[PDB]
Amino acid sequence: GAMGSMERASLIQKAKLAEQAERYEDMAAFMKGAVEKGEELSCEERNLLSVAYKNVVGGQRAAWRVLSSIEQKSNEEGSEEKGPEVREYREKVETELQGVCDTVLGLLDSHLIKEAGDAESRVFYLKMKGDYYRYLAEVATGDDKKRIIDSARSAYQEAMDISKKEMPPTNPIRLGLALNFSVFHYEIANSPEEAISLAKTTFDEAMADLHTLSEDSYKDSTLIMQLLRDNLTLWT
Amino acid sequence: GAMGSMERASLIQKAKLAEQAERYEDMAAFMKGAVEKGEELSCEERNLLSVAYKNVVGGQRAAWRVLSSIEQKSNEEGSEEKGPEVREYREKVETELQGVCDTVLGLLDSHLIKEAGDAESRVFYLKMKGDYYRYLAEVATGDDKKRIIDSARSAYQEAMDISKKEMPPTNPIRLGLALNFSVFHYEIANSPEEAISLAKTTFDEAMADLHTLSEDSYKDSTLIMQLLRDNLTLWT
Amino acid sequence: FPATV
Amino acid sequence: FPATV
Ligand SMILES: [Ca+2]
Ligand SMILES: [Ca+2]
Ligand SMILES: [Ca+2]
Ligand SMILES: [Ca+2]
Ligand SMILES: [Ca+2]
Ligand SMILES: [Ca+2]
Ligand SMILES: [Ca+2]
Ligand SMILES: [Ca+2]
Ligand SMILES: [Cl-]
Ligand SMILES: [Cl-]
């Protein structure tokens, strides 16, 4: 693409610089270019990919929520007509958000997931697939909303199945997957009891395996466990 | 341009939405479109223009400083060679920053300044002209650096001359102009004594006129006076 | 909003 | 950095 003439290693180097500079759109473009070189990604490289897009879509999601709230208020009883501009601009931001999600999903489908054989890589990418379908579901209102939700669910479920067979209950990727899938159940699938059960079971099974961990591994796992507990506190 | 088909009023409305959403690149594009309609801007509209570009260039400046520091470190004694990528990426960000500055300066030159006859409008735009030449000066290293500095100086000086003749010493625009021109002297022109003298004289002359002000005008003027005092504390 | 990673 | 507006 645009990055076709730049070396893979230079794209990775520049993604790291862009991260330091908080230039996440640049970071994402560099990492897209790196993926399109066709080689598998290392652990560090997949982390750069995920950080870049998480920050780009995160900003879009926050903006969408602001605009959606304004739009909802404009449609209340007693609200003065202001014309099509709020809807148009919410639609603009939404379309940009959907485009970023489509871009990430495209990278995963061409060809990160199919070449990922190790459990850690495959689960990482399947979690991403679930996450970006979830972000599409947050803004979906038409005749494809059900199908988008089911795509998220299917990706998360495949990731869960692998993670339970192949990874310890304290593994950070496994924990973060479960955290996010639990949020999917609560916020997207209208299944708060499933959300709560998953967060609690995940937390408890991790707690029982902490004794096996080094000081540094313990720190990572406990940090994510605290996020499970925070959600449980919010929901109960 | 891109916004040629959208109503002026709709561009203004959408700039305000973009501000609420913290979408400052969008805000700036909407306000560029509004300016290119060819009509003069109201006070509120000129504030939208300035806020949008200030935030866009502010992010670029922060990123440039990060990258410049990394680059400077890469050129120290004992630093391992890492190739052209740090310079290339600093250059990319720099070029983007210069483009934004050129865009703003272009709007001011075509035709905001020449149609601005009231002191408040003219000073506002001339302050902007000084500011964006100052931002160009921050990254300038070649045979045009002197000329860029002189362009900033000239714009600020014309603004100062009008402001002193036509505005009270407590006027917020006058105060903010002086604040920024004082920073130009300290950071760009290598004239810290001029910077200090200007900040102190401005502060003192404002203090002596506060008695004329309403509660709300007093709040605005004193807030900017505190910024003058903060700079003086930093510099002395 | 709930926590995700 | 010093304050500007
Ligand atoms: Ca190569
Ligand atoms: Ca839509
Ligand atoms: Ca493989
Ligand atoms: Ca294993
Ligand atoms: Ca019209
Ligand atoms: Ca340059
Ligand atoms: Ca006029
Ligand atoms: Ca006057
Ligand atoms: Cl729009
Ligand atoms: Cl570059």
How many A from CA of B167 to the centre of ligand 8?
A: 4
Q: How far is the CA of A84 from the centre of ligand 9 (A)?
A: 9
CA distance B180 to B199: 9
A93: number of CA atoms within 13 Å, CB side? 30
| d(C-alpha C4, C-alpha A58), whole Å | 11
Distance CA B178, CA B191 (A): 15
Distances (CA, A) of A92 to A55, A99, A113, B75, B116: 19, 11, 30, 44, 34
CA-closest candidate to residue B100, choices B130, B148, B132 = B132
B71 vs A contacts (CB less than 8 Å): none
Please indicate, yes or no, if residue A25 is contained in any of the structural domains.
Answer: yes
Closest CA to B175 of B204, B136, B146: B204
Interface check A82 vs B, CB under 8 A: yes
Asked if residue B3 is part of any domain, the answer here is no
Residue A88 touches partner B, C-beta closer than 8 Å: yes
CB of B63 within 8 Å of a chain A CB? The answer is yes
Mutate to test the interface with C, among A227, A229, A232, A235 (most CBs of C within 10 A): A227
DSSP chain A: -TTTTS-HHHHHHHHHHHHHTT-HHHHHHHHHHHHTT-SPPPHHHHHHHHHHHHHHHHHHHHHHHHHHHHHHHHTSTTPPP--SHHHHHHHHHHHHHHHHHHHHHHHIIIIIHHH--SHHHHHHHHHHHHHHHHHHHHH--STTHHHHHHHHHHHHHHHHHHHHHHS-TT-HHHHHHHHHHHHHHHHTSS-HHHHHHHHHHHHHHHHTTGGG--HHHHHHHHHHHHHHHHHHHHH-
Closest C-alpha among A66, A59, A189 to residue A134: A189
Q: Distance of CA B82 to CAs A137, B32, B162, Å?
A: 43, 40, 51
Token pair 């000081």 is found at A215
Those residues whose C-beta lies under 8 Å from the C-beta of residue A148, and which sit 6 or more positions away, are A133, A136, A137, A140
Query: What is the distance in angstroms between the Cα of B63 and the nearest Cα belonging to chain A?
Result: 5
Three-state secondary-structure class, residue B32: helix
Put simply, the answer to whether C3 touches A235 (Cβ < 8 Å) is no
Spell out the residues 6+ positions from residue A160 whose beta carbon is closer than 8 angstroms to its own: A177, A178, A181
Q: Which residues surround ligand 1, an ion (CB under 5 A)?
A: A 7
A183 touches chain C (CB under 8 A): yes
Q: Nearest-CA distance from B30 to chain A in Å?
A: 11
Half-sphere exposure of B69 (CA within 13 A, CB side): 9
Half-sphere exposure of residue B17, counting CA atoms within 13 Å on the CB side?
30
Q: Is A152 inside any structural domain?
A: yes
Please report, for residues A11, B31, B32, B36, the alpha-carbon distance to residue B2 in angstroms, rounded to integers and kept in the order given. 31, 12, 10, 10
A30 alpha carbon – ligand 10 mean position (Å): 9
The whole-angstrom separation of Cα B7 and Cα B15 is 12
A137 part of a folded domain: yes
Contact A94, A64 (CB under 8 A): yes
Q: Which ligand ends up closest to the CA of A122?
A: 3
User: What three-state secondary structure class fits B215?
Assistant: helix
Which ligand number lies closest to the CA of residue B136? Answer: 6
Resolution attained, angstroms: 1.3
Nearest chain B residue (CA) to A22: B63
What A138-147 contacts at long range (C-beta under 8 Å, 24+ apart), as own/partner pairs, is: A138/A61, A138/A64, A138/A187, A138/A188, A139/A64, A139/A94, A139/A97, A139/A98
Q: Is residue B116 situated within a structural domain?
A: yes
The answer to whether residue A85 neighbours chain B at the CB level (below 8 Å) is yes
- Residue A212 CA to residue A215 CA, distance in Å, equals 10
Rounded to the nearest angstrom, the minimum Cα separation between B96 and chain D is 22
Q: Using CA coordinates, name the residue in chain B closest to A19.
A: B63
Cβ–Cβ contacts within 10 Å for residue A13, how many? 19
Calculate the alpha carbon distances from B103 to B27, B51, B128, B166 in Å: 14, 15, 12, 29
CA distance A162 to A176: 14
How many domains does chain A divide into? 1
Domain that holds residue B154: 8-235
Measured distance CA(A193)–CA(A186) in Å, rounded: 8
CA–CA distance, D4 with B176 (Å, rounded to integer): 7
Q: Between residues 185 and 214 of chain A, which touch chain C (CB distance below 8 Å)?
A: 186-187
State the distance from the centre of ligand 7 to the C-alpha of B37, rounded, in angstroms: 15
Do residues A149 and A202 make contact, with C-beta atoms less than 8 angstroms apart?
A: no
CA atoms within 13 A on the CB side of A235: 25
Retrieve residue B133's tokens: 């030449």
Query: Which of B168, B50, B174, B170 has its CA nearest to residue B123?
Result: B174
| Min distance D3 CA to chain B CA atoms (Å) | 6
For the four alpha carbons of A70, A76, A79 and A81, in that order, the dihedral sign comes to: positive
In a domain, A2, yes or no: no
Q: What is the DSSP string of B111-167?
A: IIHHH--SHHHHHHHHHHHHHHHHHHHHH--STTHHHHHHHHHHHHHHHHHHHHHHS
**Both tokens assigned to B14:** 């959408």
CB A23 within 8 Å of CB B66: no
Distance between the two ends of chain B, CA-based, in angstroms? 48
Smallest Cβ distance to B89: which of A14, A70, A85? A14
The CATH number covering residue B93 comes to: 1.20.190.20
Q: How far is the CA of A162 from the centre of ligand 7 (A)?
A: 69
- B45 assigned to some structural domain: yes
* DSSP structure string for A128-162: HHHHHHHHHHHH--STTHHHHHHHHHHHHHHHHHH
What was the structure determination method? X-ray
Which residue, among B37, B12, B40, B174, has the nearest Cα to B114 in the 3D structure? B40
Separation of B41 CA from ligand 8 center, angstroms? 19
Contact indicator for A115, A40 with CB cutoff of 8 Å: yes
Question: Residue-wise over A29-59: b if at least 16 C-beta within 10 A, else e?
Answer: bbbbbbbbeeeebeeebbebbbbbbbbbbeb
Counting ligands in written order, which one lies closest to the CA of residue B118?
A: 7
**A91: in domain:** yes
Q: SS3 of B214, please?
A: coil
Nearest to B49 by CA among B113, B7, B104, B100: B104
Give the list of residues 6+ apart from residue B57 with CB closer than 8 angstroms, or none.
B97, B100, B101, B104, B132, B135
- Residue A97 sits at the vertex; the CA angle it makes with A95 and A98, to the nearest 5 degrees, is 65
